[PDB]
């Protein structure tokens, strides 16, 4: 009831699910499914029991190529995984009926752990997830085999690595989608420091779900950072709706119209025409054989342009089945649309700027890497406030095997555990349903 806007919401096959939903029913501040995904990502941990066992048997702990000769311990951890995980759960849970979850995967080689919400309710941040999980498994392993006081420190090194000598859990056999609080580029950035490959791994390469998960995480960070407060709130909400949630089926329909033979440029032409048709933009001035367009609603123009940008990525990198060109699309979609129209590009030039440096740092000697190692906290790609990274997730979802540093190489443990969680794997479905459910509370 703060904003009058309403949107139509669709599924990932292009079918209308719920019409006329108030914009604020998709806000991170109001929608219960966004709250559940965020709290879920804070509390979920993957444990590699096979890796802990192999590190102990070889004494290879504490980082790359590190080994301590004479410290080897041969423990049957995977063979006793059921007993070890149950013992661990007893320490992790606060009460027997709470929302603690501990589930063995891969015949006991892996475990999915979700630490109870009550621990986060009296915590400053999110590090209780890895730290509570790691000590429960260290203690459970020692207790399972009666490991001596003299040898137990090797179990700790196998589970959590070189920490506290290193700042990070260096050499650890546990993993999370978030990274430590010290690595934030600024306050409020934690939901941005989630590797693109981890998002693509958790959503099993489904393009629209990958785009949805990345957009929810990015735009939710924009609220935590204060960017979506006051004058800019509506712009960020419309961005989430049209770029990440396929609002009004605009992304879907632009991909449909341009997928067989289209290019970046053809998607642009379709989006400008659609904006005109809907009354978002109109001719303000005629020059010599050139129309200058204007708008009485910059936030809506930005949203329409952002939907075009996502579709242009899907068409361009989709046709190559190769993610690297997403840096190019992010640049020239915005560059072209400004000279096509006389209106500012997505995020008022910040997507274009992010794309300039992302192109450089994915085709040069100095740093970066392939598209899948970036994220909203990376120095190269933090500049746009939520409108760039979701396209990178879509592009990597569409990649058919051109990358050395693929989700298979960087994110295998995250894939096995985090894809088990339905709200992480298929977020679009849950956020839409929740928005429908609270529609009359707005």
């Amino acid at each position: 009831a703060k904003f009058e806007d309403k949107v139509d919401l669709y599924d990932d096959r292009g079918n209308l699910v719920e019409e006329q939903v108030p914009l604020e029913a998709l806000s991170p501040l109001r929608n219960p499914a966004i709250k559940s995904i965020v709290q879920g990502i804070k509390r979920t941990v993957a444990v590699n029991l096979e890796g802990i066992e192999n590190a102990l048997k070889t004494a290879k702990v504490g980082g790359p190529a590190c080994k301590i000769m004479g410290r080897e311990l041969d423990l049957d951890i995977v063979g006793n995984a059921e007993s070890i995980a149950a013992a661990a759960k007893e320490m992790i849970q606060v009460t027997e009926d709470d929302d603690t979850n501990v589930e063995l995967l891969g015949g006991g080689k892996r475990a999915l752990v979700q630490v109870p919400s009550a621990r986060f309710d009296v915590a400053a941040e999110y590090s209780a997830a890895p730290l509570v999980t790691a000590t429960a498994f260290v203690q459970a392993i020692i207790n399972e085999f009666d490991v001596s006081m003299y040898d137990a420190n090797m179990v700790k090194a196998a589970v959590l690595g070189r920490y506290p000598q290193s700042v990070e859990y260096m050499g650890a056999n546990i993993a999370t989608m978030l990274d430590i609080p010290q690595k934030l580029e600024g306050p409020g950035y934690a939901l941005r420091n989630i590797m693109v490959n981890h998002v693509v791994a958790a959503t099993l390469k489904n393009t629209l779900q990958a785009a949805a998960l990345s957009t929810i995480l990015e735009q939710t960070a924009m609220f935590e950072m204060g960017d979506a407060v006051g004058a800019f709130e509506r712009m960020h909400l419309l961005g989430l709706a049209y770029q990440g949630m396929n609002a009004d089926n605009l992304v879907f329909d632009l991909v449909k119209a341009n997928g067989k033979e289209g290019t970046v440029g053809s998607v642009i032409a379709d989006l400008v025409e659609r904006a005109l048709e809907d009354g978002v933009i109109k001719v303000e001035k005629e020059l010599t054989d050139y129309k200058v367009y204007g708008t009485d609603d910059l936030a809506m123009w930005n949203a329409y342009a952002a939907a075009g940008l996502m579709a242009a990525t899907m068409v361009n990198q989709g046709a190559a089945r190769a993610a690297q060109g997403v840096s190019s699309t992010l640049l020239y979609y915005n560059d072209l649309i400004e000279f096509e129209t006389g209106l500012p590009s997505v995020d008022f030039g910040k997507v274009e700027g992010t794309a300039v440096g992302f192109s450089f740092f994915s085709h040069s000697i100095y740093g970066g890497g392939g598209p899948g190692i970036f994220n909203g906290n990376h120095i190269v790609t933090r500049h746009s406030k939520g409108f760039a990274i979701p396209c990178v997730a879509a592009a990597m979802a569409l990649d058919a095997g051109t990358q050395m540093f693929s989700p298979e190489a960087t994110s295998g443990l995250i894939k096995e555990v985090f894809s088990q969680v339905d709200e992480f794997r298929e977020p679009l479905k849950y956020v839409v349903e929740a928005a429908a459910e609270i529609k009359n509370e707005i």
Binding site: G62, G70, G368, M404
Partner: protein, 548 residues
């Protein structure tokens, strides 16, 4: 016969070492010393030149009411005043740190897979040799692709280069031997077998950037500089586009996926990037020292060469300058590498263990800790009581605590073959020492030693770690002198007694087995003595680009 420190005490003092009384106050203050005389004369000249007062012996209290002692560098016949062992006055010490700071280990295993799988090109011993000729031109700061590039002066950067090693003898044989660290030449047969088995068919670069750049900039420069010139040499030697999408995989591999830093970055209160002293773990410092591959029939010599390496770097440069500054902490460190004193205590401990148990044959438990650590602590403390000259030499309680506990901890690990029980022995030594003499170290010396016993075997988040993985950023250890370098020695001790080729990382061990380094890591205390005598020639000087 004589204890090993007797010759040094006899050179320092007119009295026999057992005598309890002496004469003070009539030595002429600073005038008794050649070096203090040099300093007073320099201070007058400096002050006059710049128009601001500087060094002046009449400020504060008057040094030299007692004998200002010479120190013997242990294992040598070199005696010098302690000022000659200050890191500022000793170029060998500064070059030891530069040689570590400017080194990074960088795999070629992912790089070669990018070439074969993404580019579809071949990698052979020949293409590797061509690549190594290319990177040895580029790495010091010279160009391979662009027109109108301006370059570093080759003689200013003569100490920068790239070598490789690999456990595959046949492949190593095919690469030009100028670029190869030869594991069979540098290590005795059994150690060579172990190291080659650890490396296997992996191929690793040892990259040293220029000392002049490391001094201008910082440790976190090293892996970046290395990565830039690896990236250019990959483009040139393998015919990439000069900047295509695949170029990014070589950058991420060289900077992140297959890099071994010497040190990890530090938290904000002591903010530092990679390759600074506080990030180097004790296990790596032991493996950087190369005493293991030359003195392998003497486990005491190997362990105490590691102590010397770490006491200098961690107490004089790191704690005494990066983390504080000023006069600093020379003699807190020299106690562990001068006068043959730690050597006497540790040879006693090794002989006790050998006779009673056999090296590495004692049970790994608290019974062994209580036996060996107590026996060696009492030996060491009894020497200070029987030889008043020894007590006056190591005059600060902190110095004596570090030396006695290092003997006790090393000897405990000689018996058990395990570093964690050695560490328990170190802390027990401190507690016994404190009760025997009703003192231990400086005001804040035993912060870590009172947390000590309880954190040796803890498994909790910021408490539990094997000693080889600990270092200067382990929370209890982050502030105080007289522990870090001794901990590196205790980390080495069980491995030296076992005859292990390395302590914590075999790549780090091989990477410093290199005769092209400036500092000689096989004989660390020898080099400190050469530096004290003003006989060591460092890299990094600007004399070629300044006036005569």
């Amino acid at each position: 016969a004589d204890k090993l420190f007797i010759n040094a005490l006899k050179k320092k003092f007119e009295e026999s070492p057992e005598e309890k009384k002496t004469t003070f106050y009539t030595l002429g203050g600073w005038k008794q010393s050649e070096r203090k005389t040099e300093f007073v004369n320099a201070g007058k000249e400096v002050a006059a030149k710049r128009g601001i007062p500087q060094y002046n012996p009449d400020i504060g209290t008057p040094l030299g009411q007692r004998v200002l002692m010479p120190y013997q560098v242990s294992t040598t016949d070199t005696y010098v005043e302690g000022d000659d062992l200050h890191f500022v006055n000793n170029a060998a010490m500064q070059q030891m740190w530069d040689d570590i700071r400017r080194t990074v280990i960088v795999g070629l295993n992912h790089a070669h897979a990018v070439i074969e799988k993404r580019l579809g090109k071949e990698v052979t011993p020949e293409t590797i040799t061509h690549y190594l000729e290319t990177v040895n031109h580029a790495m010091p700061g010279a160009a391979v692709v662009q027109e109108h590039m301006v370059e570093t002066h080759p003689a200013l950067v003569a100490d920068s280069y790239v070598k490789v090693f690999t456990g595959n003898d046949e492949i190593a044989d095919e690469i030009d031997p100028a670029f190869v660290i030869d594991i069979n030449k540098q290590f005795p047969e059994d150690q060579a077998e172990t190291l080659k088995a650890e490396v296997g068919d992996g191929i690793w670069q040892v990259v040293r950037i220029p000392t002049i750049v490391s001094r201008t900039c910082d440790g976190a420069t090293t892996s970046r500089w290395s990565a830039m010139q690896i990236g250019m040499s990959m483009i040139s030697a393998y015919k990439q586009a000069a900047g295509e999408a695949a170029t990014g995989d070589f950058a991420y591999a060289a900077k992140h996926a297959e890099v071994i830093h010497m040190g990890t970055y530090l938290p904000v209160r002591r903010a530092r990037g990679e390759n600074e002293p506080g990030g180097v773990p004790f296990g790596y410092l032991a493996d950087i020292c190369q005493s293991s591959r030359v003195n392998y029939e003497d486990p005491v010599r190997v362990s105490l060469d590691v102590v010397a390496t770490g006491a200098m770097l961690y107490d004089q440069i790191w704690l005494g300058s990066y983390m504080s500054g000023g006069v600093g902490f020379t003699q807190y460190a020299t106690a562990a590498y001068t006068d043959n004193i730690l050597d006497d205590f540790t040879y006693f401990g090794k002989e006790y263990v050998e006779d009673k148990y056999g090296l590495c044959e004692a049970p790994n438990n608290m019974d062994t800790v209580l036996d060996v650590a107590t026996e060696v602590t009492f030996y060491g403390l009894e020497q200070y009581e029987e030889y008043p000259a020894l007590l006056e030499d190591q005059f600060g309680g902190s110095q004596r605590a570090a030396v006695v506990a290092a003997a006790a901890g090393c000897s405990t690990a000689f018996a058990t073959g395990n570093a964690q029980t050695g560490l328990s022995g170190w802390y027990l030594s401190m507690y016994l020492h404190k009760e025997q003499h009703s003192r231990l170290g400086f005001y804040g010396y035993d912060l870590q030693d009172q947390c000590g016993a309880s954190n040796v075997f803890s498994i909790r988040g910021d408490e539990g770690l094997p000693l080889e993985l600990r270092g200067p950023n382990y929370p209890n250890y982050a502030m105080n002198v007289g522990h870090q370098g001794e901990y590196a020695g205790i980390s080495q001790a069980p491995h030296a007694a076992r005859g292990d080729a390395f302590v914590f990382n075999p790549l780090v061990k091989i990477a410093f087995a290199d005769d092209n380094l400036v500092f000689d890591f096989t004989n660390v205390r020898g080099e400190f003595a050469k530096g004290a005598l003003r006989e060591f020639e460092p890299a990094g000087e600007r004399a070629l680009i300044t006036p005569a």
